[PDB]
Every structure is written in C-alpha cells, then in structure tokens.
C-alpha cells in the first residue's frame, strides 16, 4: 500500500508559559515515531518498534542535530517577523518527507509555513522554490542561488528518505503492514417526518484509508452525501461513516485494503 | 494572521450500550496556533484518569490530538469535552451525543 | 562497516591529465567532497557532487556515479603547483563525514634537455641533478649515509625546471658511490 | 576565516594543554580533527550549535568547550605521546543537512615527549656551488642542510640580499630520520637554491639559508649544560665568489 515518512518542525516566538519554543515530531504513516522539544532537548522514540531497533548512539546523534535545527529555526523565524514587521507571537513550520506508493513510484516534499499558511514549497522535479508573496520571494532568491543545496535536497527526498522509510517499514511491519477489515453496518431511521436518513458506519479498521459511498439502483452515485471524518478509536483502529436521505434501491459500497463490500438497504 | 478554531468530536470507541464498558474519545483537530487545553467531563466535573496523545501535526499546518478515558455509559450520566483555545472567549463544552 | 578508498599516491606528467578515484561503501549517501591540502597547509574545499554527472571548475572537474559508488577528481593540463594531497570525504546517511586517507599527487616535470650529473659541493655534500623525470632515486643502504627524495626546482625567469636529489655523510663516502643503490642514467656526468 | 593557536607546541607527558579556535564567519557548527599519517581525518569532538557538543570518533584523552558561537576550545587533560599529531579546527555554516563545506584552521602541530632533553635545534650549513656545475651548465646550485633537530618543527627559507626568494628553490617536503630505527630519531632537512652562474659570481650577492625551529617555551624548566632548545632561528650564509 502507500506509506510515508515525514518530519515536522514548529517554532513559536515569544511563547506563553507552557508552550515550547521548538517542537519536532516524525511520523511513519499515521504513527508518531520520534519527538524532540526545546524543553527536553532530547530526541526520544514514540513507537516501540522504533525504540527496539535503534541503539542509543542514534538518539544521541540526532539529539545533537535537533539542537542545531532548533537554533536555526529560532533565527529564521526572527528574520521572517522582521520582513513582515511583525511583533508578538508568530509561528514557523517545516515539513519534509516522502511517500512510497503501491506501484513503486515515489513522491517527495519539502514545505514551510508562516503563521500556519503556506510560505515556501520546494519542487524537487524542477529544483525551484515557489513563494506565496514578496517576503517568501526574498527568501527564495537566497535559497535558489545555492545550486548544490538544491541538488542535495533532491537526492535526500528521492533516495535517502525512501531508504529510511523502507527501513522503518520493516522495523514496524507487524503494525504498519497489518490489515484489520472494517465492521460495517447500515442504519435507517425516519427523522423529520417523511425524511428517512441512511447511515453507513464502519469501525475497527486499519489502515485508516477507507472508501465509502452510496449508490442508487447499482449504477449511479447518490447526489448529496455527508461524509464523516476518519477518526481514531484509540485502540489503533479507526472509524468513519457516510450518510444520505432516502426519497429506489440504495446500497453502501465500502473498499478497504483491496476488498470491496456492498450493503444493500432492503 | 489566520487563527483556526478547533473542531471537537466526541465519540465512543465501540458502538455504545448502557452498562457495557467502553472508551470515550475527544478528538480535537484543525486548530492553529498550538496552545490548547482539553478536559473530559462527567456531569460537569473534570475526569482525572484521562489519557491523551501528544500534540500532532497535520499537512495543512494545523494540529490535532486525542483525549480518552475508560467509562461505562448509563442513561443518567452526561459526558462532554471541554476545550479552550486562543480563538475562544471561554472554554467550549461539547456534549457527547450518546452514539446517536 | 563503512569505508572510503582512494589511492595513496599518484604520479603523472606535467601538461597531461590525472584522474583521482574515490570509491565509497556507506549505508546511505548525502554528498561527496574533494579537498586540496598542500604539504604543511590546511585542506581547502575544491568540489561537491551529490547527483550524477561531471561538474567543471576551471582545470578541475569532479564526477559522481551514485550507482557505482565512486567519484573522481580530474586535473587537466597538470602544473607543478598541482602537487598536493587530495582528500575525498563522503557524508553518510546520518550526515557524518567519512574521510578517505588522501591521495598524494606527484607531478613529473617535462625536462627539455636532460644533462644528468653528480656534483660535489663544499661547506661533503653530493648533488645528483638535471636528470630526466623517468629516473627514480633510492634510499641509502647505510645508516650513516643520507639521501633525499627527488626535488623539482623552477627557475621561473629562465623557464627552466630541474630534478635533483642530495646525498651526504661524514663517514670516511665519495660522490662516485653516493647513489650506487639507484639506477642512474649511463651518461651521467661525474666530474673529476 | 578560522584562527587556531598555537601553530607548534612541545609538551611533556602528563602536561595539560588547551588549543584555541575562533571563527569570524557566523558559523553554527565547529569541529576538532586530528590528522595522522596514513589515515583520514578523525573527528575528536564537534559542536553542532552554540550550547551543545558531542564526542566524535576519538574523544578519549580530550574534552571541549563551545565557549560561545565563535570559540571552540580543545583540552588535553594529561598529554600522552599518542596525542602527538596535527590538530585541525574547522567550522561550517550548519551541520548535518546540506552541501555546506568545511572551513579549516591553519593547523596545530603538537609533539608530546616523555623527556624534553631530547629536544634539539637544527645545525645549519650552506654548501657552495661546484665549479664543475658552473662550467658544465652556467648555473649554480647552493645546498642547505639542517641536521640533528628534534622534533620536526622547522620552516626553511632562502634569503638573497635580505629578501626571501622562492624562484629556483626546492626544499624537501619531509625531513628524513637520521636514525630511522629509533622512535625518537632526530631529523635532517635539505634544500637547494639554484641561480645563474653570473649571479653567484657577483661578490655583492649574499645568500642565507634560514631555519625557523619551534621548540621549548620560556615556561619550560631547563637545567642542562647545553643551551635551552627554545624556539629560535638558525642560519648559515655565503657570499658570491670567483
Ligand atoms: C534518520 C533521520 C532522522 C531525522 N529526524 C528528524 C527529526 O526528528 N526532525 C526533523 O525535522 N528532521 C529530521 N530529519 C531530517 C531526520 C533525518 C534522518 C535521516
Ligand atoms: Na480562550
């Protein structure tokens, strides 16, 4: 299936009493794998299958790198607030990562945000930075003048990031590569007088990716469908739903991990 | 500057039945910036034995996390999730819909 | 474990080219650096490669093949001043640099008019000089007899270069036997 | 860009020593390497950022202080002979990610000895050109020998009429061992300066071979009969002839 590795950084200027100035977390698929912040100043595993397969020297090495990345984030945020002539508390965020999809093709991404809005987006295929406004355009110019750094990021996204992801996927295979099929049920109920609601509800499934839709007479999709969010149930599995109002033959169609399911409403 | 107020969803781990043990979830998501306060309530009183994930990061740059506690639903007990965030003038109390 | 390999020493001729190879065996790869270090000096950055291809910077070019795990540093139109050590360094998957042990590059001057000779200098010293660059000088087989390596000097205003090696001793040693342990040109001038 | 001191130092076994490094380039990462014959640079300690440091590959016998963003000191708590080496400090804009290169200091040559009484300055002599070379080639090679010195802390230069010269000079890149079997052999170094015959035949021309030796400091205690082998210049000279 499709797997992903990504690392986030968050910087906050002038934080309130309990908010770290810097936080960095890594994920494989929906699973946190690592954490670091300016309070602990220590990189720590967040998944047992990461802790069990990476020796202390690894955590020590990346702790040192994160302490540098924290300092660099602090300075970059100070410079961004200056460009915007902003005071008070503002945020800076980074996301880097890659995906390995089913057909063996890969994606890679690297992006920055200021105050929670897109700021700079790297396109590894053209080796350029897309900027949202003139302040970002200023930073883009500097970064695009360093040809070698652009090439380095392309190599990291396309080769290194994928190799690390495959390594972690093997470490966590009993978790990340398992399948728990959904339990699916259809409920009908008259609500407002003369208005029948149909709910198709799924829970207990892993991975979280699931397709749910309503069809009419087998061929056509129903017009106004309401979709529930895919929500963690807290035990490692997820839940979701889709609903319609009935007015001739309706069915809920569910696809999860290569298995299709149909629930006809009698 | 664009601040985004939390979405707050309260739901049981399993389909709920009165008198059967379960878990009550509060998923707080889509908010920015990251400072947030979350409590689970039973008849208006904060529940002390509550689990919660660490602050989590979304690709759209917002944050989310999950609070939960073991509980046995009954007809008479009212459960809720109380959330404060810079976008809110006062804490927002979101009642569990009893798996309706 | 991880390894990075480059030859200990290379010798090429003035005016020609040389290719200094650096092979690496690492779990991951984040770039390959070349540094130049003249004897007694600090290394200075020459080049960086991280994707596949050849990047030219004047007389120097650096090549990378990620799939073959090797790089080379190419020096065109070699000059005596290119005599130096050349260090390769690879950034591994944890962004740590692994250093090769360095390649000492020796350049053989193009001697236009060889005139091999062994002269005696006074304040007891013997000077083997003006021989062709194909000649090599061997160390002495006597604890009390000292012989230097070949040295190239450049009389710049005359556009003239010459090889030389020096031998000395205070043992009761003449310049006729001084370089006996070396293979010297048959027409070497031994003044009387 | 990167300033490290001292360039040369002789230490007695067990003595304490601090190497200084400063960089005025606003770099965040700094490094201390040792360079030994036959192997790649080895990282001793590094500092990814102001306020953190960590061991490298060979930390034992050393420690460091990232004093501030500019300075990264390397301490030898109790000097051992195996710490005889050439030490290089370096910095980079950041460490970890990126294509950023290292900027190296000039290097510190440290020699650790059990007994300072093995330290000797060079003797220096200049050998005048052969008359047979002058007649056979119309050129004149002077030879300088620096002999009997220890440690190998020397810089040889040629001076004609009071100004250093470089054209026509070749100095051995490495000194040779006078006693190659001994771990603490003294050293010899040779150099040639070649000039035109007519320049040598001008008696107004003065040739001086200069050897700067780096040895003991004023702080070291010395009680021997021979003169304290301090850092010093030793020279030999000749005048143009015939
Ligand atoms: C193994 C590895 C771990 C990494 N960890 C982090 C991290 O915790 N946070 C971050 O923003 N970037 C990282 N990055 C970029 C990493 C990179 C690698 C290669
Ligand atoms: Na509030």
PDB file of N, CA and C and ligand atoms in Angstrom, chain B residues 84-90, ligand 2:
ATOM      1  N   UNK B  84     -10.374  24.829  25.512  1.00  0.00           N
ATOM      2  CA  UNK B  84     -10.054  26.243  25.414  1.00  0.00           C
ATOM      3  C   UNK B  84      -8.907  26.435  24.431  1.00  0.00           C
ATOM      4  N   UNK B  85      -8.936  27.570  23.740  1.00  0.00           N
ATOM      5  CA  UNK B  85      -8.014  27.910  22.665  1.00  0.00           C
ATOM      6  C   UNK B  85      -8.092  29.417  22.482  1.00  0.00           C
ATOM      7  N   UNK B  86      -7.021  30.015  21.952  1.00  0.00           N
ATOM      8  CA  UNK B  86      -6.983  31.474  21.828  1.00  0.00           C
ATOM      9  C   UNK B  86      -8.158  31.996  21.007  1.00  0.00           C
ATOM     10  N   UNK B  87      -8.705  31.184  20.091  1.00  0.00           N
ATOM     11  CA  UNK B  87      -9.845  31.613  19.280  1.00  0.00           C
ATOM     12  C   UNK B  87     -11.166  31.628  20.048  1.00  0.00           C
ATOM     13  N   UNK B  88     -11.206  31.110  21.272  1.00  0.00           N
ATOM     14  CA  UNK B  88     -12.435  31.019  22.050  1.00  0.00           C
ATOM     15  C   UNK B  88     -12.420  32.014  23.208  1.00  0.00           C
ATOM     16  N   UNK B  89     -13.534  32.736  23.395  1.00  0.00           N
ATOM     17  CA  UNK B  89     -13.633  33.668  24.518  1.00  0.00           C
ATOM     18  C   UNK B  89     -13.746  32.943  25.849  1.00  0.00           C
ATOM     19  N   UNK B  90     -14.336  31.759  25.859  1.00  0.00           N
ATOM     20  CA  UNK B  90     -14.469  30.954  27.060  1.00  0.00           C
ATOM     21  C   UNK B  90     -14.327  29.502  26.647  1.00  0.00           C
TER      22      UNK B  90
HETATM   23 NA1  LIG E   2      -9.554  31.223  25.090  1.00  0.00          NA
END
